[PDB]
Structure formats: C-alpha cells, structure tokens
Amino acid sequence: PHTYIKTPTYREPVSDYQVLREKAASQRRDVERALTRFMAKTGETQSLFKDDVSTFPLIAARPFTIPYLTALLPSEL
Amino acid sequence: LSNTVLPSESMKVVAESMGIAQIQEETCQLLTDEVSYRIKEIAQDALKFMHMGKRQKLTTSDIDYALKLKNVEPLYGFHAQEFIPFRFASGGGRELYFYEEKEVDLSDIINTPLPRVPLDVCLKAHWLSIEGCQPAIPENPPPHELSVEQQLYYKEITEACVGSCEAKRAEALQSIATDPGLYQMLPRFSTFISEGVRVNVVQNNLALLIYLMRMVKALMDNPTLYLEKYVHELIPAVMTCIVSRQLCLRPDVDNHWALRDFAARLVAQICKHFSTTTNNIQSRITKTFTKSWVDEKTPWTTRYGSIAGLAELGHDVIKTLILPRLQQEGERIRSVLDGPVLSNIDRIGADHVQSLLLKHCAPVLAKLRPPPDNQDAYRAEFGSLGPLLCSQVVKARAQAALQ
Amino acid sequence: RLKPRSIHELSVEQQLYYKEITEACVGSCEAKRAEALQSIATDPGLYQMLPRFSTFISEGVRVNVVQNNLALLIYLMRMVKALMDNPTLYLEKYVHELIPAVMTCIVSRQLCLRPDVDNHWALRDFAARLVAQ
Amino acid sequence: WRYGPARLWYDMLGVPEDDLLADENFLMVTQLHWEDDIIWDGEPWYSIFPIDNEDLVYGRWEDNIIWDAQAMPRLLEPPVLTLDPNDENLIL
C-alpha cells in the first residue's frame, strides 16, 4: 500500500453527550468563578469571615438610586 | 447627462387610442420631443410656485398654477387625497397597466363622518436664542457567540488593560495568567491583541503597546490554555514591538527601546515553547530578523529590534549571525565619533545599538577566545567591544568566586 | 460559521505503515525488526513521516533511561543507524533531536544491574559511538 | 465586524461602516544542544497528535508588521474578522 495508497479520512467528532455536558458545565462554572473573583478583588469587598479576601470574596452591596429598574427589568430579550 | 424624453413607443400606443393604424417612426420622434419639451416647461414653472411660496414639496396645486400660466386648460380631479396605484394586465401578448377604478354608493358619501373644523391662522412669539445658545423651551429642538457571563468577563478584562489604573490591570493580568477555563475566549483575545497592535499605526501609542505585550506575556503563562493554534495572531504582534521603526509619538524621549527587549524576550519564549520541526517557527523568525539586519537602508530602531531578538534567541545564533557582521560596528562608528550632523536622532539610536551589541557580544567573546585578552579590543572593531569583553571576563570570574 | 475539519498530512496507509514499523522496531521478533530496519533503510517515501520517527526516537530514549531498559535502547540505536544510511531523506533538519539521544546512551549511568548486560552496554555504547562518529 | 471582538480598537480608530544567513546556520543540528535537551534524571508529551494550523505554520506573519509605517501597503482600515471556526472542544 505505501507505494501508491492514500486514505483521505476525516476526524472522529465527539458525540458523547455526557462529556459535552461536563465540558460545558465546567467551563461555565470556571468562567463565572474567574469573573466573580476578579470583580470582588478590584472593588469594595465584604467577607463572611474576619479578614477573608482570598477565600470566598463577596462583591460589596451597593445601593441603587432606583432599585426597581435593576430588579424588575429583563436583561436578555 | 443627456436630453431625456418620453419613449417613442409610448406615442404608438397613444395614436391607436385615436384610431391611427400605422404611424411611422419619424412622426413618433416628432411627437415625443415636443411633449417632453412641454413637460420640462411646466416642471420648471411649478417649481417657481414651490420656491416663491415656500413649500419644498411640489403639491399638485403648483402644477395647476403653472398650467394656468401657460394658458392651457386645467386638469380636473387631482386635488383629492389619492396616491399612485397601477394594475398590471398580463394578457396574450399585450402588456399594459391601468387604473382599476372603483365605485361607491351615493348615500355613503352623503353619510360620511365629517372631518373636524379647521383653525384660523394665529401668531406665536418665543425666544430662539437669548444672547447665546438656545433656551430649552418646548418650541425648540431637544439638544459560537459568547454567553453573557464570558461576554462580561471579556469586556471587563479587556477594558482593565487599556490604562485607567494600574492595580486593576495587574489583577486582570493575574486573572489571564491563572484561570483554568479561558478557552472559548482565546480567539477573541488573539483578535483583540493583533488588531490593537495594528491600531498603533494610526496612533503611535507606546503605552498601549506595552500593555498589549504584557497581555501576551500573561497569556503565555497560563498552564491550562494551549496557544499553539491561536499564537498565529500573537507572534506578529510580539514581533511588531521588535521590527517596526516608529514605536513612539515623540521619538527622542519615549523609551521604545524597552518595548523592544521585552518583546524580544517574548518572541524567544514563543519560539522556545512552540517551535517544532513541522512548525519551523524559529528558523522563519531568524530568517526575518537576519534579512532585516544584513540589509542596508534599515533604520537604527529596526536594526536594534533585529539585534535584540537575535541576541535573545541564544548563544549559537549570535555566534553564527551577529559575529560575522561585527565590521558593521565600524559603519556605525562612522556616524557616532565623527560628523557635524550631531543634533539628529541618529546618534541616540546608534549608541543604543552599540551598547546592546557589545553587551551581548561580550559573553560570546568570553566563550571563543583566550583567557588573557591583552589587545583583543585593538583586534576588535573600534577597541570598545574588546574592553566590554574584558569586563565580561571579569564578571565571569566574579560569578565563579560567588559560586 | 461552522468550517470544515482538517486532515492529517499522512495517509491511513502511511499511518498504518508507521504503526507497523514502530511496533516491529521495538524488537519483539528479530526477523520483524530486521525487515523493518531494512524498510527504514531504503523506503524512498519515508520523508514527510520523518518528524514522527525522530520524535518517537528522542522521546523514547528519554523515558527509556528513566528505567535503564537496554533492549529498548539497542533497538532505538539500530533505528537511528537505519535512518541514517537511507539516501533519499534529508536528515540534518532533525539531527538536533538525534544527537542528544545518542549522547545520553553513551554518557549515561545504567539503572539496571551493570554486570549482566555490560557486554551489551559496551555494545550499546559502541553502536552509539559509531552513529555519533 | 465593527461590533465584534476588537470593537474597542475599532471605536478608538473611529471607523463606522456597519553568510550568517546561509541556510545551514539555521538547521537545528547547528543550533541545538542535545545534552541540554535530555532530562538526564534531573529535577514533551507531543507529536503523536495528527494536525496543526496553516497560517502560523505557513504564512509570513513576519511581514504583517509594516517595518516602515510611511511605506504601508494598507493604512488604518476596518480589517474585518473572519469568525473562521476551527480548533476543538468548541461546541460549534
């Protein structure tokens, strides 16, 4: 075969619903954890424990001037 | 461009409404350059009632005032509220358009709802400008797709590296370097970086280029994401801060020099981690640096970038690329020790090139020469590289003593 | 915009050939080795597969000196010698991976007991010195 | 795409539509230390993977960076992205 043979095959795709659910879930969890840690580190922060910024940082609660606009309104429409 | 008239085949159709069976084509040309001449004389006299009576609309009472002006009998029935309808008739070979008029029972016009009574003309005064700008009274004019989570993360991370403050930038770069799931946002970061380095040509911002090179350096330190596929945008951006000539807005005071050695260290890292014999990254980077350095007419900034990248690649590269063209130092010292043209910028760049050259060629001279080095400087070009080599041998002896 | 998928630059006959030659060159049977070595020594189309052979050699010796497996090494050195005398392929693009592999073979300690296979260890060094020269 | 990734750059720009060079010196036998590469029991994982890219592998990205701004084939431009889908793991 090597003398004159060529196999133009494709690439086996991933159809595993289990590992695709796991990949999408873990990527969403990791990007939301990275986003919330970045936003809690570069702003005012609270903490459930005394002087706890590295582990479980909370974004500090800021008051709105009009709170029903950020509560009731839909953001994806 | 040309005199536009009604078509001559529109007069054969009109002549058969009359009863004229055969009309020759020279008669039809005689008809249509007259009726399109009288259309243009009522088109331009209707426009004199549209302009003198200030309207900019050309209502149908403007044409009726112009037909009254040319003595021709008026056209009855064009003041009612109508529009432009036409109805196509296909037929067995006769293609035409007509009106398709409709009817209405007479008692449904006697019993129509009447419109509301009009108002009379009155005057109203209001200030338009009061010694300056207009007041704000109501009579005036008024004046595959990223999810939202990672779209917000992309927005915050990219706007943290544009230069509002340094601490948010350091936390954003420590986010990029140390997060596990930033794939699916790597092509967006590569596009952002490559287009942002391209936008340096419109605005020669040194600071934003330093920020983008620290963004690339943070992207390289991430253990989880593999940039082999998306490094294609990154290397020209990294080599951009190495081989372009205007990296500064004010060329004399801006230290484009550091974005040079930082990006040179960056490209040495990008071809240490990713060069494979199928890639040929390092050989193709050395070839661009080499034909940019050996070729004359190149500015001292781009020669500085070429020498900086070649000298950050390693020791054998400066053995087989830099050391043959050490005589070029004489061509450099032609324009440094000697020349009335002193107040140009070709001196600071030249002695920066000189300092980088002798700093990087001092350990190469310490590797391939005798231990004495008595008059190696005299044997060297300009006798300075040799002094630097003696200093390098002294530094190596000090390092050995420390060990 | 869903784009098409790329293909590997080897055919599946070529990829199967690479798998058979590498599984024969780890020397389970001696006649299989010897043909595979002659096949490496005179295949004209063995270029464009040579990165994968050089990487298999280099990577092999480095994880094969973690435990000093002498045959694994004697077979890889014979594979290097069979790669060198092939006249068609261009080797000095890949010699930067080939030379540190033969260097360690000659200059390395033997994690396996030294006395039993010292004659083969000397022969392994002898094969390594011959390829290095 | 003006509104896509790199919109920040597009907005900042304001565009709104929508002998030592001999081949041998560079052969990696003359530029690589074999002894250094080996771990040698002192305190990889690749090439058994089938395919790579084309641009980075083949294109001359080195030419991308206009060495001289004044002599530029292309000046500030929209430079639209291609959304070219590839790689892997990417759901679509």
Side-chain angles (χ1 to χ4, degrees), chain A, chain B residues 1-363 366 370-372 377 380 383 386-387 396 398 400-401, chain C, chain D:
Chain A
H2 51 247
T3 61
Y4 37 26
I5 224 281
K6 245 108 17 132
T7 325
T9 335
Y10 266 103
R11 169 94 186 180
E12 146 150 5
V14 257
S15 269
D16 211 10
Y17 186 71
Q18 156 76 37
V19 73
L20 262 291
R21 281 303 297 275
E22 172 65 30
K23 281 312 164 51
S26 68
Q27 286 199 2
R28 180 193 51 84
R29 295 290 304 277
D30 288 330
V31 69
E32 87 185 31
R33 178 202 167 83
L35 176 57
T36 53
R37 295 220 161 217
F38 169 67
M39 207 81 58
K41 269 151 189 163
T42 69
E44 297 316 291
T45 183
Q46 305 201 61
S47 64
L48 300 103
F49 292 83
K50 283 294 190 282
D51 297 334
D52 200 21
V53 175
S54 78
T55 316
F56 312 133
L58 288 173
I59 315 181
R62 65 159 303 261
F64 309 101
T65 56
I66 293 179
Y68 60 81
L69 281 186
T70 185
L72 304 155
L73 273 180
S75 76
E76 292 322 294
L77 78 160
Chain B
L1 170 136
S2 158
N3 179 22
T4 47
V5 286
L6 288 176
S8 294
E9 273 84 354
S10 178
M11 311 285 141
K12 279 198 62 192
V13 171
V14 161
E16 289 154 356
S17 298
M18 290 283 300
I20 302 175
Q22 291 300 110
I23 175 168
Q24 46 187 352
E25 85 289 330
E26 199 270 330
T27 304
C28 275
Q29 186 44 243
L30 199 45
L31 274 166
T32 188
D33 51 0
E34 181 68 28
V35 72
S36 306
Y37 155 74
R38 305 293 191 172
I39 280 168
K40 295 171 198 163
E41 301 193 308
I42 314 179
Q44 83 170 5
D45 287 30
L47 216 56
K48 288 166 181 174
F49 295 94
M50 197 200 80
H51 278 328
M52 192 58 66
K54 284 83 177 174
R55 274 194 294 278
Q56 65 166 26
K57 192 44 188 183
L58 202 66
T59 59
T60 48
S61 45
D62 293 16
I63 294 188
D64 269 320
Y65 283 163
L67 302 155
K68 188 177 176 305
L69 191 47
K70 306 277 184 171
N71 206 13
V72 57
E73 202 204 359
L75 295 162
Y76 314 93
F78 282 93
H79 295 297
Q81 186 215 8
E82 61 172 56
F83 48 89
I84 186 163
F86 278 90
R87 179 91 182 268
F88 186 88
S90 307
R94 306 205 149 278
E95 181 172 85
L96 55 90
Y97 297 80
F98 56 96
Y99 280 161
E100 187 71 15
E101 65 210 354
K102 76 187 302 302
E103 312 182 339
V104 53
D105 279 279
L106 260 184
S107 199
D108 305 64
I109 321 185
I110 307 165
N111 306 136
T112 176
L114 187 73
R116 44 185 270 149
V117 56
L119 320 174
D120 205 22
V121 189
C122 82
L123 209 63
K124 179 178 211 314
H126 74 95
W127 288 106
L128 181 61
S129 299
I130 315 178
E131 282 178 19
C133 66
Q134 312 187 245
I137 52 182
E139 289 95 299
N140 282 9
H144 316 86
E145 290 124 301
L146 278 185
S147 171
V148 47
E149 299 69 357
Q150 42 202 19
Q151 218 161 350
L152 181 58
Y153 183 70
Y154 179 72
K155 183 193 88 72
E156 296 290 322
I157 284 298
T158 50
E159 298 169 353
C161 298
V162 300
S164 77
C165 68
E166 169 65 34
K168 287 179 66 180
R169 143 172 302 128
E171 300 297 325
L173 294 181
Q174 280 159 337
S175 179
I176 293 178
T178 57
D179 291 311
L182 303 195
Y183 341 94
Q184 171 62 224
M185 300 182 50
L186 202 40
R188 281 96 199 183
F189 277 134
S190 86
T191 332
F192 172 79
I193 283 159
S194 62
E195 294 283 317
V197 176
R198 265 196 199 165
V199 159
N200 168 65
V201 71
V202 255
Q203 302 93 357
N204 300 23
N205 199 327
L206 174 136
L208 296 199
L209 289 191
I210 291 189
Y211 302 148
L212 288 158
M213 286 304 114
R214 304 203 316 115
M215 211 164 171
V216 175
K217 192 249 185 180
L219 262 182
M220 268 186 230
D221 306 338
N222 211 336
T224 54
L225 52 84
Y226 321 109
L227 322 83
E228 325 174 315
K229 311 282 185 156
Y230 295 134
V231 132
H232 65 305
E233 305 205 57
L234 305 195
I235 342 196
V238 171
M239 188 180 285
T240 292
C241 306
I242 304 169
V243 298
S244 178
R245 58 173 216 78
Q246 266 194 350
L247 268 287
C248 310
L249 189 62
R250 323 174 73 281
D252 225 68
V253 98
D254 285 352
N255 204 220
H256 44 334
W257 304 127
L259 181 50
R260 298 300 178 83
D261 51 57
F262 181 59
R265 218 168 315 127
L266 211 49
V267 77
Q269 189 183 351
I270 212 173
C271 82
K272 180 197 84 166
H273 282 315
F274 295 111
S275 178
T276 309
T277 323
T278 80
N279 269 322
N280 278 301
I281 285 187
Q282 180 158 335
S283 177
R284 289 208 288 169
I285 282 178
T286 15
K287 202 178 176 188
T288 61
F289 280 164
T290 292
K291 76 160 75 177
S292 187
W293 187 42
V294 179
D295 175 47
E296 254 88 21
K297 311 151 58 198
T298 43
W300 289 110
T301 56
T302 82
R303 294 185 95 117
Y304 183 81
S306 298
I307 294 169
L310 284 182
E312 265 300 326
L313 287 193
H315 158 55
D316 298 82
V317 162
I318 74 178
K319 268 191 66 164
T320 188
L321 276 311
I322 304 287
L323 263 292
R325 300 201 62 231
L326 201 71
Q327 51 91 14
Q328 188 259 359
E329 183 180 332
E331 180 265 336
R332 182 209 45 83
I333 212 160
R334 198 274 303 166
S335 161
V336 173
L337 286 175
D338 204 283
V341 198
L342 187 134
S343 294
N344 61 1
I345 85 177
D346 313 354
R347 206 163 295 243
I348 183 81
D351 105 296
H352 264 289
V353 159
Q354 175 183 12
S355 76
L356 187 88
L357 265 174
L358 66 100
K359 179 177 87 163
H360 282 128
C361 292
Chain C
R1 279 118 180 135
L2 293 209
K3 183 178 179 180
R5 250 101 61 63
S6 75
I7 48 183
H8 199 282
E9 65 271 17
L10 297 184
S11 191
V12 77
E13 142 49 21
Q14 277 179 306
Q15 204 152 345
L16 181 59
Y17 172 80
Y18 166 79
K19 196 191 172 201
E20 295 295 339
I21 287 295
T22 51
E23 287 201 306
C25 278
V26 296
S28 177
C29 180
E30 214 277 334
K32 270 202 153 188
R33 170 136 27 77
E35 162 56 8
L37 258 55
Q38 279 160 125
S39 183
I40 292 172
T42 187
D43 206 317
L46 203 140
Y47 95 102
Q48 192 261 335
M49 211 186 315
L50 195 43
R52 306 319 222 303
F53 264 119
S54 189
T55 329
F56 166 72
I57 289 176
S58 320
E59 193 60 349
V61 174
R62 68 136 289 272
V63 86
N64 282 170
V65 93
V66 154
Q67 53 296 280
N68 196 289
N69 291 186
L70 279 95
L72 284 196
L73 268 71
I74 238 160
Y75 299 151
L76 291 152
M77 297 313 285
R78 289 267 297 273
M79 210 184 323
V80 168
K81 159 75 183 51
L83 264 186
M84 273 190 310
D85 52 358
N86 199 305
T88 301
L89 43 86
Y90 179 87
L91 253 174
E92 59 264 22
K93 205 207 259 198
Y94 311 93
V95 100
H96 72 284
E97 285 170 47
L98 257 58
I99 292 175
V102 315
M103 281 307 147
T104 179
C105 297
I106 270 185
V107 308
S108 173
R109 305 205 81 156
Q110 150 191 343
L111 292 254
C112 300
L113 59 179
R114 30 77 183 179
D116 294 12
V117 62
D118 198 296
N119 168 28
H120 283 276
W121 136 266
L123 187 164
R124 191 181 82 185
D125 286 6
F126 234 44
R129 62 75 204 150
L130 182 60
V131 307
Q133 81 91 327
Chain D
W1 261 229
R2 151 80 162 201
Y3 306 98
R7 69 166 310 158
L8 175 270
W9 298 122
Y10 296 148
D11 297 7
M12 289 211 334
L13 220 324
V15 311
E17 37 269 50
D18 191 358
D19 318 7
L20 274 38
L21 268 142
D23 296 4
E24 106 100 18
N25 298 233
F26 314 131
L27 261 41
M28 331 257 83
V29 46
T30 68
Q31 287 196 8
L32 230 168
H33 204 238
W34 338 302
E35 303 117 280
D36 228 33
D37 232 42
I38 312 162
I39 16 127
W40 254 351
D41 302 328
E43 263 85 30
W45 163 66
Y46 271 125
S47 294
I48 317 298
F49 68 91
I51 48 59
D52 226 327
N53 219 348
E54 268 181 318
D55 266 308
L56 207 205
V57 177
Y58 298 119
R60 272 200 55 88
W61 40 254
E62 321 125 79
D63 302 3
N64 262 355
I65 330 120
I66 213 13
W67 333 59
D68 26 26
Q70 187 293 293
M72 75 310 6
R74 24 230 141 243
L75 218 5
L76 197 271
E77 236 40 274
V80 307
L81 15 140
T82 58
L83 275 247
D84 171 287
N86 240 327
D87 239 2
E88 227 91 37
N89 305 281
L90 261 61
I91 316 167
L92 33 274

